[PDB]
Amino acid sequence: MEISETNIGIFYVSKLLALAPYSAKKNSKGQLEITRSWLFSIYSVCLCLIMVFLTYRGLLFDANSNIPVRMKSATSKVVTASDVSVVVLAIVTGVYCGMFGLRATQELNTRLDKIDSTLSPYNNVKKDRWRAYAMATVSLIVIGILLGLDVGTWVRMAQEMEDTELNVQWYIPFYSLYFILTGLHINFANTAYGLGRRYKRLNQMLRTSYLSATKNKSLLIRAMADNHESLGKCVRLLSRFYGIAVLFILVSCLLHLVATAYFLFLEMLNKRDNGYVWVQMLWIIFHFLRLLMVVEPCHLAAREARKTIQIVCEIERKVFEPILVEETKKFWQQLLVDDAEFSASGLCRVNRTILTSFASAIATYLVILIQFQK
Amino acid sequence: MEISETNIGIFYVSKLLALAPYSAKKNSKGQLEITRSWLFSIYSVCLCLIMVFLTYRGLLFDANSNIPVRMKSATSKVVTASDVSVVVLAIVTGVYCGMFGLRATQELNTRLDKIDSTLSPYNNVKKDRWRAYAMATVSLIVIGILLGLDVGTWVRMAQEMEDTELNVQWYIPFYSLYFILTGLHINFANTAYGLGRRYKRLNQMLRTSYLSATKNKSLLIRAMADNHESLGKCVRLLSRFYGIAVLFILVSCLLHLVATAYFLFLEMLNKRDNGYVWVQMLWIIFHFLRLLMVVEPCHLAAREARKTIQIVCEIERKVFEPILVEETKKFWQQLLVDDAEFSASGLCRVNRTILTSFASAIATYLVILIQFQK
Amino acid sequence: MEISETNIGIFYVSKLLALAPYSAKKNSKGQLEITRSWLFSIYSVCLCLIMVFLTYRGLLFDANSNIPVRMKSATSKVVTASDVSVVVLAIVTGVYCGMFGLRATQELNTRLDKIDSTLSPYNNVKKDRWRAYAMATVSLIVIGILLGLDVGTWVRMAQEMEDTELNVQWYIPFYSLYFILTGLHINFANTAYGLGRRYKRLNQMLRTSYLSATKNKSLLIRAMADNHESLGKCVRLLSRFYGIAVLFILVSCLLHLVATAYFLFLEMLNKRDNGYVWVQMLWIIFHFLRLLMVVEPCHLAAREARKTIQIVCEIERKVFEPILVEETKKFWQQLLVDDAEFSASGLCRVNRTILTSFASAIATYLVILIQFQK
Amino acid sequence: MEISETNIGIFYVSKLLALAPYSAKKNSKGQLEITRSWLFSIYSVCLCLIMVFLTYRGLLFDANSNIPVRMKSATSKVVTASDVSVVVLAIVTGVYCGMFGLRATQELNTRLDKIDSTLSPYNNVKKDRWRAYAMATVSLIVIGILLGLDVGTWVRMAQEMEDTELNVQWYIPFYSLYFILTGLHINFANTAYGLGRRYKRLNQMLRTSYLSATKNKSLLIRAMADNHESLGKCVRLLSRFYGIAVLFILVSCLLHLVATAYFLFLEMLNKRDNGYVWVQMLWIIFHFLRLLMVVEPCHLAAREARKTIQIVCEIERKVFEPILVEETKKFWQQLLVDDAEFSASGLCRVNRTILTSFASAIATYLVILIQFQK
């Protein structure tokens, strides 16, 4: 993942949420270096293990209690256990990916520094820092308000329907796991959006340099080809770093969307208190936004990477210089055999098409379920 | 979208249906220009908002009425609300796409003028105008008769089963929204069919120029390559202009097809009045024709664009001139890395394959639903 | 479709089954020519219309009879009507494709003659004639015995459970339509297998000419490239000729497989007479064999066409002659941008993958249906 | 399949499990040769036929017994018969593939020897032998303990719920068929992993030779291209050898996963003895491990084969030698048109994506089934 000064605070968040057991330090001549932090690695492992144990322990006491409010019937038990276990699995996979991703992180950061060295005019450090910090703050604030509203509505329903603080305490670890999941989403989205921005800047450089002395252009094209290859390598590195984590995040999004939609439709049919309906609608919106935060950056990066070949062809059709058109032909040959789609550890390609697939499931699972009640 | 004299009347229809908030005016030396029309933009926004509010208000009064004829039971309420809301969503998305699509429209029209300047022998202005006007008139006439028949059968059923004009008045806005949807279909089909026709004309020029003095052919091949690239850019521009609108139109087609088929099968099982059966069959035919009007032009354009590479290869195998065969090799290289499939904002590729997918859903959703009644 | 002497009898069968309204006649200097036969065209149209009317009339009298044996309950009526109508639709589509496919047939036959002129050593006229006639005879014999067994078991069940010859007479037209469908399958399989055989012969020529004086090889490679392009054009011509017919044939295969499997499982659960079980098993085998007869030739042709590029690359790596390696490079360039997959009028690609898709449906439709009985 | 000294013992296992009716013998000057073993071929055919007959006979006596413990109800009969028949089908297909795969085996082994002759520095004979023998021993030990545990829990349940040794004897042949299936998995995994290892070694050679006198490098690149083509041919040979067997193995994995998950959920709902729950969980883990053992090697080989083009491009961008860059261009041209994905006899491509598809089924089949109980 990306560790840059412009979004250094992001890294700190990832370090505080048991997802970045690393330490970043400038050396003498610039050059931030990322090394393993044994203290923070131990802290992250212990925190993840303790929190998973705590949430499962709370679930087990809720099931083995003389008055349950969320376990209750067998189907409710199964749904709640599946949801909690899916979140737990996503959290554990993210912590594991951050645990053994030191070498990939250093390689990606070195490649990103090398790439950003060339694209000096298009840096926009202030704008990128502002956007990244705004995204992180917005996501954290939204998840905080949503967790507060959920706990408030749950305590309200348990109070109207008397020994509820114990259940709330048992269920707090689930909410902290949701916080960690939000942090994981923030980290992955930041890295993928950085890759997409660098691809867009490369395309803009290629467009400006030729649509709007020959040796400067020759090594410019050479550096552009090198940067495109390095960006492809960075995409592959991010895939290796976060593939299984993103796969389990997508599984979590699908499961939560289906379960929340089914519960919302059932509650609307039963015509119960509207506050739970608003809470469920907010949860649906949050899950859809999570799915978008995962899918959109990968699709944007893949689309921006594939456009470079058209600009290269247009450049080729507007060159009367032989060594530089030879370099352009080499660039076109390199781009023809190239991929930049983020792969969830090979199981699927992460782009907007995933959304369609999810719909094709979310509808089907609903059609079997929604009308089975009646 | 396309704004040309040959189908200028089409644009007027799109302007009258709150879908084209633009003004087209010739300047001095030919050259139609498209500019933003503030009056018509405000009119379109106000009309869309007022009509959506009116149809939802009619639905809400129908639900909160002492005698409902379309809301009634909970499942009927859900089906009717989903259908109306889907049409509303498609209408709103189309109006939004036309609202903020000024720059794309001007770019597409300038590119189309540049392309059509080269293909002077193959213009067929009278034929294209006749076909476009016939398509628009046929679609409007069909939707008018269908809406009249639907309102007639609904008023007949409500009269035989007494205070019905109020419900008809409440439901008129739904029919006007259907009119706007038909206009949106007409506009998109016109643009996509124009792109397909231009691709076919380019292919015919390439076939005729070589299957049936060398510098004329050299710049002819250069202009053909430029026109093919510009047509690809126009396809991408149309995708950017109408992607989300086409996606929601496809969702509308699928939902309406499934709902109408289910209702028709249920009515046939109940063996009720046959007039409603004929009305439902007409609605099914109309929805299928809408789906075809969306899918067929995109598939035709994609197929016609992909054929150019075969003609280019055949030309390459029949050339003994070195600079022009070099140009032909450049054309082949450009065509090899090229796409022209219309994408519904990246979620799916719009071609005839979509039909198959729809069947794979329409059957499944029916199998779960049709036999669940018995 | 293919009209050659080696399988001329096949054409006669297609002429007798209202599928080939053409007349083939040698001219003076060899050169069979295919022309429109007005008498046979009128005969085919009248026979198809009369037979469709007869089968639907028999179905309608069976439904409106005081004792039905196949209509009976509403679900049985729906299943029988859907099956009969699907067969009718496939028959009508095949007759329509043969009705307006004169120009495609002549073009395909001329291209096939031109191709076969080059591949003189690999002709095997006796072997191809024997195989084609054996396939046609086997298919006709199998369908005859299956229809006889089905009518025998139906008359036996109606006799044990008395005025049955009337129902048998009403249902005979369905069996004649099955005969026409078998003829359509034979025709399509013959054409596709001929295309695949020609592709294989081209590949064998390419392998033998180089793995086992230079101008002979140069024009040999030129003729091989021309023949490959012509074979691709022939595949596209067959697609244009039989796309919608093959699509409806595949729909028929899927529907019949699902319905027969469901009926067989229901009968086995009810533990009724075993003779109907054997008849249903034979029908399942026949439907699977029909699906294979449609899918396998297209997949074989597509696989054999795609292999040529590997042989061309191997030839390129073993050539020290400059004009002929230039020709080989042109051949490789032509093969790189090329497709030969049979497309069912653009809706789907016909290959073995279709089988998988069918399973993914046949299982699902069964899971919803088989366990719904219990 | 692969017959090498490093894993010669593996072959012996495949010979003892009626899957490798061959005999491997060194000739005078090295060069192991594989010939048909008539004695072992007859033994394999007889053993497979006798074992299939024995397991079906045991099933039939269990069904026609005055006290059944696994047939019982109709749905239990159907599930057990389908599972046993699926295992039988996989076993028969594997034995048939090994029966008529002599020529493919010799061709693959000769090609593998030719390839391994070039990659002399990267041999790791001890490591490969250790890994292969460890994999075989681990798989056999796991299946042995699982079969023992299953028979123990079945005899325990039948004893607590008395004439059980007869049923255990009737069901032993099913367990021996499971042993044969495990052997088939071991053989296929060994061959595919060998292909993947050779691809990885080729990539490592290409990386080392250039990232870290010119004629040596020229014939080195030539030999690398030859080895890559031969590895592709070996992948195609393995596909031809084991396609239908792998397809039926995948069908077996899907069916067993779905059935075991459904039975486990039903048992957990019924809250019966936990020992059967642990046994079912172990069976689920084993089926998932089988599916991984089939899918992972093919995906790894396909991924390692596709990476060579990037290394070739990087080499091309770092060469100032004209004949060798010409050879590199030829290598790039060969790699551009090339595939190495294992195909299950054309029906599907075997990679990690299959897993996703399986989930998309396993969920759906469960959603229809799991909640239908309640």
Which run of H or E residues covers position C114? Answer: helix C102-118
Distance CA B197, CA B200 (A): 5
- Find the closest chain B residue to A317 by CA distance: B330
Supply B271's token pair: 């063996």
Helices B165-211 and B125-160 pack at an angle, to 10 degrees, of: 160
Solving technique: cryo-EM
For C149, residues 6+ apart whose C-beta sits below 8 A from its C-beta are: C279, C282
Q: C126: which strand partners?
A: none
Q: Which one of D229, D337, D348 has the shortest CB-CB distance to C353? A: D348
Residue appearing with tokens 């027969």: C260
Interchain proximity B345–A352, CB inside 8 Å:
yes
Helices B165-211 and B102-118 pack at an angle, to 10 degrees, of: 30
DSSP secondary structure code for residue A329 in this structure: H
3-state secondary structure of C34: strand
Distance CA A344, CA A188 (A): 12
A194 CA: distance to closest CA in chain D (Å):
23
Distance CA C46, CA C41 (A): 9
> Cα torsion for D307, D313, D315, D320, to the nearest 10°?
170
Distance CA C141, CA C134 (A): 10
Choose among A355, A245, A358, A238: nearest CA to A305: A238
Q: What are phi and psi of B122, to 5 degrees?
A: -100, 85
Best of D269, D304, D312, D313 to substitute, by most chain A Cβ atoms within 10 angstroms, is D313
Domain boundaries along the sequence of chain C: 5-370
Cα C96–Cα C102–Cα C104 angle in degrees, nearest 5: 100
D70 is in an annotated binding site: yes
- Residue pair A87/A217 in contact by the 8 Å Cβ criterion: no
Distance CA B327, CA C65 (A): 74
- Residue pair A242/A119 in contact by the 8 Å Cβ criterion: no
Q: Which one of B335, B360, B367 has the shortest CB-CB distance to C368? A: B367
Sign of CA dihedral B302, B304, B305, B306: positive
- Find the closest chain C residue to D73 by CA distance: C269
Choose among B263, B253, B250: nearest CA to B286: B253
Cα D5–Cα D10–Cα D12 angle in degrees, nearest 5: 90
Query: What does each C-alpha distance from A349 to A246, A290, A298, B122, D295 come to in angstroms?
Result: 11, 17, 9, 43, 17
Distance CA B302, CA B196 (A): 8
Q: What are phi and psi of B34, to 5 degrees?
A: -110, 125
Choose among D10, D20, D197, D224: nearest CA to D105: D20
D120 burial class (0-12, 13-18, 19+ CB within 10 angstroms)?
Answer: exposed
Supply D370's token pair: 């799991």
Q: Which one of C225, C348, C368 has the shortest CB-CB distance to B356? A: C348
Query: What does each C-alpha distance from A114 to A31, A120, A230, A234, D71 come to in angstroms?
Result: 11, 11, 9, 11, 68
3-state secondary structure of A320: coil
Q: Which one of A337, A346, A365 has the shortest CB-CB distance to D367? A: A365
Q: Which one of C313, C360, C363 has the shortest CB-CB distance to D333? A: C313
B74 CA: distance to closest CA in chain A (Å):
8
Distance CA D344, CA C343 (A): 22
Interchain proximity C303–D364, CB inside 8 Å:
no
- Residue pair A184/A241 in contact by the 8 Å Cβ criterion: no
3-state secondary structure of C22: strand
Which run of H or E residues covers position A314? Answer: helix A308-316
- Residue pair B234/B112 in contact by the 8 Å Cβ criterion: yes
- Other C-beta atoms within 10 Å of D18: how many? 25
Q: Which one of C75, C334, C347 has the shortest CB-CB distance to B374? A: C75
Chain C partners (3+ C-beta pairs within 8 A): B, D
**Amino acid at residue number D281:** M
Residue appearing with tokens 């007798």: C16
Exposure class string for C234-266: b at 16+ Cβ within 10 A, else e: bbbbbbbbbbbbbbbbbbbbbbbbbbbbbbbbe
Which run of H or E residues covers position D36? Answer: strand D30-36
Distance CA A218, CA D304 (A): 33
Cα B221–Cα B227–Cα B231 angle in degrees, nearest 5: 145
Choose among B1, B39, B46, B6: nearest CA to B21: B39
Supply A103's token pair: 């070498």
Rama region for A84: left / alpha / beta (φ>0; ψ in -120 to 50; rest): alpha
Interchain proximity D225–C317, CB inside 8 Å:
yes
Query: Chain C to chain D, count of Cβ pairs less than 8 Å apart?
Result: 45
C287 is in an annotated binding site: yes
- Find the closest chain C residue to D364 by CA distance: C364
Cα B25–Cα B31–Cα B37 angle in degrees, nearest 5: 25
Resolution (in Å) of the shown entry? 2.6
**Amino acid at residue number C280:** Q
Residues of C in contact with B319 (CB under 8 A): none
- Residue pair C288/C339 in contact by the 8 Å Cβ criterion: no
Distance CA B267, CA B261 (A): 10
Q: Which one of D269, D299, D310 has the shortest CB-CB distance to A74? A: D269
DSSP of A14-72: HHHTTS--EEEEEETTEEEEEEE-HHHHHHHHHHHHHHHHHHHHHHHHHHTSSS-SSS-
- Residue pair D372/A364 in contact by the 8 Å Cβ criterion: no
Helices C274-306 and C353-370 pack at an angle, to 10 degrees, of: 150
Task: For chain B, give the secondary structure using H, E and C.
Answer: CCCCHHHHHHHHHHHHCCCCCEEEEEECCEEEEEEECHHHHHHHHHHHHHHHHHHHHHHHHHHCCCCCCCCCCHHHHHHHHHHHHHHHHHHHHHHHHHHCCHHHHHHHHHHHHHHHHHCCCCCCHHHHHHHHHHHHHHHHHHHHHHHHHHHHHHHHHHHHCCCCHHHHHHHHHHHHHHHHHHHHHHHHHHHHHHHHHHHHHHHHHHHHHHHCCHHHHHHHHHHHHHHHHHHHHHHHHHHHHHHHHHHHHHHHHHHHHHHHHHHHHHHHHHCCCHHHHHHHHHHHHHHHHHHHHHHHHHHHHHHHHHCHHHHHHHHHCCCCCHHHHHHHHHHHHHHHCCCCCCECCCCCECCCHHHHHHHHHHHHHHHHHHCCCC
User: Which residues does a chain break follow in chain B (C to N more than 2.5 Å)?
Assistant: 161, 212
3-state secondary structure of A307: coil
Chain D partners (3+ C-beta pairs within 8 A): A, C
Residues of D in contact with A372 (CB under 8 A): 371
Residues of C in contact with B367 (CB under 8 A): 365, 368-369
Helices A274-306 and A165-211 pack at an angle, to 10 degrees, of: 30
- Other C-beta atoms within 10 Å of B70: how many? 18
C90 CA: distance to closest CA in chain B (Å):
17
**Amino acid at residue number C212:** S
| Maximum alpha-carbon separation in chain A | 84
Q: Which one of A348, A364, A372 has the shortest CB-CB distance to D371? A: A372
DSSP secondary structure code for residue A346 in this structure: T
Choose among B358, B182, B214, B359: nearest CA to B286: B182
Distance CA B200, CA B307 (A): 9
Distance CA A179, CA A184 (A): 9
Distance CA C301, CA C199 (A): 7
Interchain proximity C348–B353, CB inside 8 Å:
yes
Q: Which one of C356, C363, C367 has the shortest CB-CB distance to D348? A: C356
B343 CA: distance to closest CA in chain C (Å):
17
For D336, residues 6+ apart whose C-beta sits below 8 A from its C-beta are: A336, A337, C336, D309
Cα A243–Cα D291–Cα C351 angle in degrees, nearest 5: 90
3-state secondary structure of C240: helix
DSSP secondary structure code for residue C25 in this structure: E
Q: How many CA atoms lie within 13 A of D218 on its CB side?
A: 11
- Other C-beta atoms within 10 Å of B30: how many? 7
The binding site of B for beta-D-fructose consists of 70, 150, 178, 280, 287
A322 CA: distance to closest CA in chain B (Å):
14
Residues of A in contact with D299 (CB under 8 A): 346
- Residue pair D46/D78 in contact by the 8 Å Cβ criterion: no
Question: Which segments of chain A are extended strands (E)?
Answer: 22-27, 30-36
Chain B partners (3+ C-beta pairs within 8 A): A, C
**Amino acid at residue number A124:** N
- Residue pair A167/A62 in contact by the 8 Å Cβ criterion: yes
B102 burial class (0-12, 13-18, 19+ CB within 10 angstroms)?
Answer: middle
Interchain proximity C337–B368, CB inside 8 Å:
no
Distance CA D11, CA D301 (A): 21
Query: What does each C-alpha distance from B141 to A300, B7, B8, B147, B281 come to in angstroms?
Result: 42, 18, 19, 10, 17
Q: What are phi and psi of A338, to 5 degrees?
A: -170, 145
Interchain proximity B269–C74, CB inside 8 Å:
yes
Q: What are phi and psi of D160, to 5 degrees?
A: -70, -25
For B231, residues 6+ apart whose C-beta sits below 8 A from its C-beta are: B115, B195, B198, B199, B202, B305, B340
Best of A218, A347, A348, A353 to substitute, by most chain D Cβ atoms within 10 angstroms, is A347
Query: What does each C-alpha distance from C328 to A144, A159, B40, C23, C309 come to in angstroms?
Result: 66, 82, 61, 41, 10
C317 is in an annotated binding site: no
- Find the closest chain D residue to C338 by CA distance: D337
Distance CA A83, CA A91 (A): 12
Query: What does each C-alpha distance from A15 to A3, A24, A88 come to in angstroms?
Result: 11, 11, 19
- Taking the mean position of all CA atoms in its chain, how far away is CA D61? 32
Choose among C303, C309, C282: nearest CA to C353: C303
- Other C-beta atoms within 10 Å of A257: how many? 22
Query: What does each C-alpha distance from D6 to D2, D9, D131, D234 come to in angstroms?
Result: 10, 8, 10, 18
Interchain proximity A367–B369, CB inside 8 Å:
yes
- Residue pair D136/D186 in contact by the 8 Å Cβ criterion: yes
Interchain proximity C352–D345, CB inside 8 Å:
yes
Distance CA C199, CA C197 (A): 5
3-state secondary structure of D32: strand
Helices C274-306 and C214-270 pack at an angle, to 10 degrees, of: 160
Distance CA B8, CA A76 (A): 60
For B138, residues 6+ apart whose C-beta sits below 8 A from its C-beta are: none
D334 is in an annotated binding site: no
- Pairing between β-strand D30-36 and β-strand D22-27 as defined by DSSP bridges: antiparallel
3-state secondary structure of C45: helix
- Other C-beta atoms within 10 Å of B204: how many? 14
Distance CA B71, CA B88 (A): 17
- Taking the mean position of all CA atoms in its chain, how far away is CA A358? 17
For B153, residues 6+ apart whose C-beta sits below 8 A from its C-beta are: B275, B276, B279
Chain C residues touching chain B at CB-CB below 8 Å: 74-75, 225, 229, 330, 333-334, 336-338, 345-348, 361, 364-365, 368-369, 372
Supply B348's token pair: 């799916």
Q: B34: which strand partners?
A: B24
Residue appearing with tokens 């519904």: B344
C256 is in an annotated binding site: no
- Residue pair A22/A35 in contact by the 8 Å Cβ criterion: yes
| Maximum alpha-carbon separation in chain C | 84
A214 burial class (0-12, 13-18, 19+ CB within 10 angstroms)?
Answer: exposed
Exposure class string for A330-353: b at 16+ Cβ within 10 A, else e: bbbbbbbebebbbbbbbbbbbbbb
Q: How many CA atoms lie within 13 A of B323 on its CB side?
A: 8
DSSP secondary structure code for residue D337 in this structure: S
For C140, residues 6+ apart whose C-beta sits below 8 A from its C-beta are: C13, C182, C183, C186
C12 CA: distance to closest CA in chain B (Å):
35
Question: Which segments of chain C are extended strands (E)?
Answer: 22-27, 30-36
Interchain proximity C317–D330, CB inside 8 Å:
yes
- Find the closest chain D residue to C296 by CA distance: D346
- Taking the mean position of all CA atoms in its chain, how far away is CA B151? 25
Query: What does each C-alpha distance from D296 to A221, C105, D2, D302 come to in angstroms?
Result: 39, 48, 18, 10
Exposure class string for D269-292: b at 16+ Cβ within 10 A, else e: eeeeeeebeebbebbbebbbebbe
Supply A122's token pair: 């298009």
3-state secondary structure of C26: strand
Supply A82's token pair: 């599946």
Distance CA D359, CA D374 (A): 23
- Residue pair D129/D7 in contact by the 8 Å Cβ criterion: yes
